[PDB]
């Protein structure tokens, strides 16, 4: 079973803080309450690797009692009650921190780094949104039927709006679970089959999520996880997927080998389902489907929006007695659910480690 | 014979007389009616060296001190207060008492001869300062004198660098001078351009000194209206450098210009002081009554001076030997035994704790001080300094800065001789017998201390009534009593006569070092804690944790349950910390200049506030932080609350460790889990 390998290969360690220590905690270890929020435009700090080495040297000089380049500028967070450290390099006053820091790969070559305190989110995913008025008149009840309609719908400062990897930074928390699918399949795969084998990882994944945090009430019928399948299927050899789930209600996660726990237990609960390695299988070589090593401190996933130099675009697997479908087709635009330390949407708990 | 009140002595002019080891001295008086008076002194080679405990010729080649050169003393610090304590030795052994503030009779050649004791005197006025200066000195340059001495105070350095390049006083941007007039003064740069005339006046004096076959001609600054200053020291130097460069500038006499202070020494020195021992011709005090009463007290050369006020630091082996002859043999042979870990009277071995008792703690106010004054006469068969001593011991009981010059007097009094310590400690001994001897015979039972402090159980009170102030009373009497006539039997006479404090009376003690004891009232929820350092904010936020701990920990009253609350207290600490993660000078560590961070280059380019570095280093972390070396507000990576928290926690468990086994017999050493739980909050 399942219970069985929680039960002997995981070992759970949380520290339940509380009243003002939790918002403390919430407030310093998470991106700013408006580092996600959209931005008509954006204040940041772009630039290829080399200019961002020599723009940091010359934050230094403007940073005199700090000691003294993806260490650095993922170290460059604090705020007190005056503008934080960072504003040297992105040369605002009214940033805030913790902030998020991109990895852009560059045609032809190279790679740049950005670290944003706010962006034009609707830039980037308008051309992916569905109208309330379209959702709402489609009129489909199944919701295999319904999410399947719906997905059947749908410089270094300008590049980084078509490749832009998300930097895992293990200062800070984690409020989503971010899992790297790479199916590798040896026939090709239709698309409700796919679906509906989307359908089977939620359910078993969400089991999992139950297990590992058991003060939660994760409904396995409503709980928010959200598909993006990087662009009729036409994909033969890999099959890339995100799938993205909130932390459950009083959770937050801290580490890099937390997380790395917390995506193989899930793993291993998806390989458990009998339904999903059915409706799955016989497509699919090998069985590795979630890249655990992606976690560690200084590494890059591409977020869902940008592609490879395939957008990552969504599946919308719409839950079973999901109860407003509108908002769940329009979490998949809110970056907040698709970035590692957003904010979270009492007391709290921080899974600290599980071994 | 001028009925008159010197208001300072400063010395003049050091000179060799025509033919040969008897260098004389020329003084400056600061004299004052109901005025400006000079006193010639000579001191001789023997006098200089038991000052110093070095040559002559090195005393009078700071002659160059007439001159631009401003910190003459960092070159030979001990020299100077060897000649200043030595000139104010030769003055009153040739010119007689004499007694700054103090109604006076003087009679003055132009040399005051003679000056023996003698109205309302005028009360000192106060002159208030304020003053800031940019020194430009090239933090490279200040970077290379640590490179050599990697201890040094920076401070230090920073003087030492304008003594290297003198010129950096010159271009300096640059007072207030409030005086009951005012003066204020720009300098953008203090060699280019209120009055300086109703601040100061101007005097020239004729003099014919014995040792100098000419009419010396003597100009001086004269304080009008104000008798001192109330308050940086380059600052300072550099002022009053224009100030001697401008008035001894046409054909005269030219004075000292030396000042001491620990920013002088290499490895500082813990208390502030600027001494003026040189041209200005006036202190600067850097509440200030107290610094007013020391200055008059012991003429002014405290601190500047050191131990030497009291006595010769060569002189004082002989005492040392003389006052060990005095003493009861049994008394001697303990002088002669001593040795600093020895253990006298049996006391509570730690690990340990005293349950519902009378606890008490007494203490005899200032012993240390009233036994040095006691064996200086004892061992008298030139007794200025001594008197000096006996006069702070009779005033320090009500005069709390007198007490402070004796806490650092009677240990800077052996920070020299290395067997007056031993007279200390012998006799000290003797006095600890004596308690133990009497607590035998007054219900009462020695728990631990020294002898000057101590603490017991009085193993016979009823752990309850009224009937308790009564007996501690009975035994602070009989113990007052004996002490006191165990030291006459000696032939040691005190000053006034011994108080046995009572400190306080509590129920419960814990003890878990040899200084560490907590005390508490179990009546009335009062404690005390000591042995817990307090080497920041965060430690005084953790010894107020460890208190309530231990409230709640003997209101007990199993082990486990013990280490619950223990736990708990721990975890609410940690998460407090976190609330004040950021807070960079709450995790700053006092670091002396003896316990080994390096400093960042960075600080080398704090300007002005190197400049008051002269005794503790305030550090953060790993890299380490000197969060006083940097202009305010600081920005900082996040600050290493792990390490701190590491480290206070270390203490902490020393403490509940011992109350754990004290109280309850577990030999289990208590442990905190942080890297396991709460490591992550700091990660």
């Known amino acids: 079973n399942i219970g069985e390998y929680v039960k002997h290969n995981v070992t759970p360690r949380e520290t339940v803080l509380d009243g003002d220590t939790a918002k403390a905690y919430l407030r310093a270890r998470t991106y700013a309450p408006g580092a996600l929020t959209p931005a008509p435009a954006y204040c940041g700090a772009v630039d290829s690797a080399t200019k961002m080495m020599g723009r940091l040297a010359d934050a230094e000089k403007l940073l005199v009692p700090r000691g003294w380049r993806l260490l650095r500028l993922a170290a460059t967070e604090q705020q007190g009650p005056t503008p934080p450290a960072i504003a040297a390099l992105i040369r605002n006053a009214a940033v805030q921190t913790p902030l998020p820091v991109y990895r852009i790969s560059m045609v032809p070559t190279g790679q740049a780094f950005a670290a944003l305190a706010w962006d034009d989110w609707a830039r980037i995913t308008r051309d992916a949104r569905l109208a309330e008025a379209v959702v709402s008149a489609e009129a489909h009840p199944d919701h295999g039927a319904l999410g399947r309609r719906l997905t059947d719908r749908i410089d270094a400062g300008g590049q980084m709006y078509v490749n832009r990897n998300e930097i895992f930074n293990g200062a800070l928390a984690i409020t989503n679970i971010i899992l790297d699918l790479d199916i590798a399949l040896k026939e090709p795969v239709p698309f409700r089959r796919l679906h509906e084998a989307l359908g089977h990882f939620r359910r078993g994944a969400l089991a999992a999520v139950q297990l590992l945090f058991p003060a939660a009430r994760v409904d396995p019928d409503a709980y928010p996880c959200y598909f993006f399948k990087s662009a009729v299927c036409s994909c033969t050899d890999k099959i890339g997927l995100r799938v993205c789930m909130p932390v459950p209600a009083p959770y937050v996660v801290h580490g890099s080998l937390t997380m790395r726990g917390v995506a193989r237990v899930i793993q291993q609960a998806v390989l458990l389902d009998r339904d999903f390695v059915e409706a799955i299988g016989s497509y699919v070589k090998n069985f590795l489907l979630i890249d655990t090593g992606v976690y560690a401190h200084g590494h890059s996933l591409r977020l869902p929006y940008f592609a490879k130099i395939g957008r990552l675009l969504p599946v919308f697997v719409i839950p079973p007695a999901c109860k407003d479908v509108p908002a769940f087709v329009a979490a998949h635009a809110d970056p907040r659910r698709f970035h590692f330390h957003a904010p979270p949407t009492r007391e709290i708990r921080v899974l600290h480690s599980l071994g | ?683």
């Not at chain 2, 090195?58 to 160059?64: H, I, L, M, S």
């Not at chain 2, 006499?253 to 030396?258: D, I, N, R, T, W």
């Not at chain 2, 320090?396 to 310590?421: K, M, Q």
């Not at chain 2, 080398?604 to 006083?628: K, N, Q």
Request: with cysteine; aromatic share 10%; charged share 20%.
């Open chain 2, 1 to 683: 014979w001028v009925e008159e009140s010197v208001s300072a002595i400063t010395l003049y002019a050091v000179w060799l007389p025509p033919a040969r080891e008897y260098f004389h001295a020329l003084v400056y008086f600061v004299c004052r009616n109901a005025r400006a008076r000079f006193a010639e002194v000579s001191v001789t080679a023997t006098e200089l060296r038991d000052f110093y405990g070095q040559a002559v010729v090195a005393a009078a080649r700071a002659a160059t001190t007439p001159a631009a050169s401003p910190l003459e003393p960092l070159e030979n610090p001990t020299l100077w207060r060897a000649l200043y304590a030595c000139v104010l030795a030769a003055l009153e052994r040739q010119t007689g008492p004499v007694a700054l503030f103090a109604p006076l009779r003087i009679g003055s050649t132009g040399l005051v001869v003679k000056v023996e004791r003698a109205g309302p005197p005028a009360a000192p006025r106060a002159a208030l300062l304020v003053a800031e200066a940019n020194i430009d000195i090239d933090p490279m340059a200040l970077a290379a004198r640590v490179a050599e001495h990697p201890d040094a105070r920076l401070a230090w350095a920073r003087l030492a660098a304008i003594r290297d390049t003198p010129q950096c006083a010159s271009a300096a941007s640059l007072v207030n001078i409030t005086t009951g007039a005012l003066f204020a003064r720009e300098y953008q740069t203090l060699a280019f351009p209120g009055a300086f005339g109703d601040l100061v006046e101007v005097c020239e004096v004729g003099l014919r000194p014995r040792g100098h076959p000419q009419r010396v001609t003597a100009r001086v600054l004269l304080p009008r209206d104000y008798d001192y200053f109330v308050s940086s020291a380059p600052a300072l130097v550099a002022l009053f450098r224009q100030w001697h460069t401008t008035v001894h500038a046409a054909p005269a006499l030219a004075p000292v210009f030396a000042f001491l202070g620990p920013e002088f020494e290499v490895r500082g020195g813990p208390v502030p002081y600027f001494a003026v021992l040189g041209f200005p011709g006036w202190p600067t005090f850097t509440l200030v009554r107290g610094a007013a009463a020391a200055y008059a007290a012991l003429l002014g050369a405290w601190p500047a001076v050191g131990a030497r006020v009291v006595l010769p630091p060569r002189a004082w082996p002989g005492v040392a030997s003389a006052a060990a002859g005095c003493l009861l043999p049994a008394v001697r042979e303990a002088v002669a035994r001593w040795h600093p870990a020895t253990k006298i009277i049996q006391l509570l071995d730690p690990p340990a704790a005293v349950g519902p008792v009378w606890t008490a703690r007494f203490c005899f106010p200032g012993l240390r001080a009233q036994l040095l004054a006691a064996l200086a006469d004892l061992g008298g068969s030139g007794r200025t300094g001594l008197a000096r001593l006996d006069a702070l011991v009779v005033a320090a009981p009500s005069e709390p800065w007198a007490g402070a010059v004796l806490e650092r007097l009677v240990p800077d009094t052996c920070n020299a001789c290395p067997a007056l310590r031993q007279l200390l400690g012998g006799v000290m001994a003797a006095v600890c017998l004596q308690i133990e001897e009497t607590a035998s015979s007054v219900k009462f039972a020695v728990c631990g201390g020294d002898g000057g402090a101590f603490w017991g159980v009085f193993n016979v009170d009823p752990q309850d009534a009224d009937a308790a102030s009564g007996v501690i009373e009975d035994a602070r009497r009989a113990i007052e009593t004996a002490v006191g006539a165990v030291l006459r039997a000696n032939a040691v006479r005190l000053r006034h006569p011994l108080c046995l404090a009572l400190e306080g009376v509590y129920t419960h003690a814990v003890a878990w070092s040899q200084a560490g004891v907590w005390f508490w009232n179990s009546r009335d929820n009062t404690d005390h804690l000591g042995g817990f350092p307090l080497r920041g904010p965060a430690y005084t936020t953790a010894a107020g944790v460890v208190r309530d701990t231990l409230r709640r920990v003997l209101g007990l009253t199993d082990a486990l349950t013990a280490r619950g609350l223990m736990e708990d207290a721990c975890d609410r600490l940690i998460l407090d910390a976190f609330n004040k993660r950021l807070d960079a000078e709450y995790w700053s560590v006092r670091v002396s200049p003896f316990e080994a961070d390096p400093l960042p280059p960075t600080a080398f380019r704090g300007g002005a506030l190197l400049d008051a570095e002269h005794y503790w280093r305030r550090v953060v972390r790993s890299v380490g932080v000197p969060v006083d070396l940097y202009p305010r507000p600081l920005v900082l990576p996040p600050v290493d609350c792990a390490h701190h928290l590491r480290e206070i926690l270390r203490e902490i468990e020393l403490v509940f460790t011992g109350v754990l086994a004290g109280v309850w017999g577990e030999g289990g050493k208590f442990v905190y889990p942080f890297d396991d739980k709460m490591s992550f909050l700091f990660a």
